[PDB]
């Protein structure tokens, strides 16, 4: 049945709760972002209202074929009213169209649901700053001190340098980038831009990317694989057989692949700096696994919470095991003690 941590008390609302059937008491279903663990169960036959960002609404229409009468898109950073309750959508710094949700309850309680997010000090200057938050529903994916990762900017620098050097040395090398959901677009767009190429991809993926309000996107992506020296592939194909196979399909246009798998974390981060990352290589194929995270590091998360000072924290990730839960509660307490709330 729907877990408690997907229900907003004192409203008829749920968040990211589409795989339980009709939830008893729910009048409006919010969707934070277009990732399959969160939308799971939405389809063209869904007949209740769905409240979301404009980009997420483009995706439900065009990718899931949800009928339009049921899609309720809202602007960001704007006070809106849903079934009598003031709400605000905030940029989550996750994937395109991902939002955090502010609920202002009739009784005076204020609730922030982060969805999936990568905390950043820029959030400390939105509409969050203007009033107190009583309850925080927190994206705790990496809520343990071992999880340190570099800035997104440092990771893209590494990728752009590496790609530029490989193709300048061998103009017949192809760059391949793995993907399996929206998000991490800067990886493949930043590399394409340094090489003066478009990114070539499947028709399906191309459609997806046209949903995202990306400025100048027609100048950046294509379905013609021949014209382009950065290709996007299903992540599942980012290995030596999958890449040799793809190289065979290019018909002697290329003689080397450099591939990037943008992974979340990899325990190589507990020993190795970004400058000190190395590929797995076999013959004329090299694969780099790069720690491009769209979730908070442990330190980023801690700073955000110590700044916000919520009265109660409700974890939404890693809640399935008693040892995980108990470990997160002990950190929350350390954070509160350290800061005096
Ligand atoms: Ni996500």
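^ structure tokens above, recovered residues below v
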């Amino acid at each position: 049945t729907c877990p408690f941590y997907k229900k907003i008390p004192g409203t008829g609302f749920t968040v990211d709760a589409f795989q339980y059937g009709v939830v008893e008491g729910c009048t409006a279903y919010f969707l934070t972002h277009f990732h399959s663990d969160h939308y799971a169960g939405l389809s063209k036959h869904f007949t209740f209202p769905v409240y979301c960002s404009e980009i997420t609404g483009n995706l439900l229409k065009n990718k899931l074929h949800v009928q339009e009468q049921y899609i309720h898109p809202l602007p960001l950073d704007t006070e809106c009213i849903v079934n009598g309750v003031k709400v605000v959508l905030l940029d989550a710094n996750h994937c395109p169209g991902a939002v955090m949700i502010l609920f202002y309850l009739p009784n005076g309680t204020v609730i922030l649901h982060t969805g999936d997010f990568r905390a950043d000090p820029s959030m400390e200057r939105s509409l969050l700053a203007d009033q107190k938050v009583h309850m925080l529903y927190l994206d705790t994916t990496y809520c343990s001190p071992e999880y340190t990762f570099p800035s997104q900017q440092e990771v893209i620098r590494f990728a752009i340098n590496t790609a530029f050097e490989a193709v300048t040395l061998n103009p017949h090398a192809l760059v391949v980038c793995g993907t399996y959901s929206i998000g991490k677009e800067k990886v493949f767009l930043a590399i394409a831009d340094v090489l003066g190429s478009k990114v070539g991809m499947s028709q399906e993926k191309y459609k997806t990317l046209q949903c995202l309000n990306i400025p100048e996107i027609n100048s950046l992506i294509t379905t013609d694989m021949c014209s382009s020296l950065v290709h996007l592939l299903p992540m599942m194909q980012i290995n030596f057989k999958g890449l040799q196979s793809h190289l065979k399909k290019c018909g002697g246009k290329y003689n080397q692949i450099l591939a990037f798998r943008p992974t979340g974390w990899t325990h190589s981060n507990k020993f190795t700096r970004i400058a000190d990352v190395i590929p797995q290589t076999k013959g004329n194929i090299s694969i780099y696994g790069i720690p491009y995270s769209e979730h908070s590091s442990y330190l980023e998360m801690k700073r955000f919470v110590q700044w916000l000072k919520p009265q109660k924290i409700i974890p939404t990730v890693n809640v399935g095991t008693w040892k995980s839960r108990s470990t997160m509660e002990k950190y929350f307490r350390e954070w509160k003690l350290e800061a005096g709330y």
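The chain has eight helices and 18 strands.
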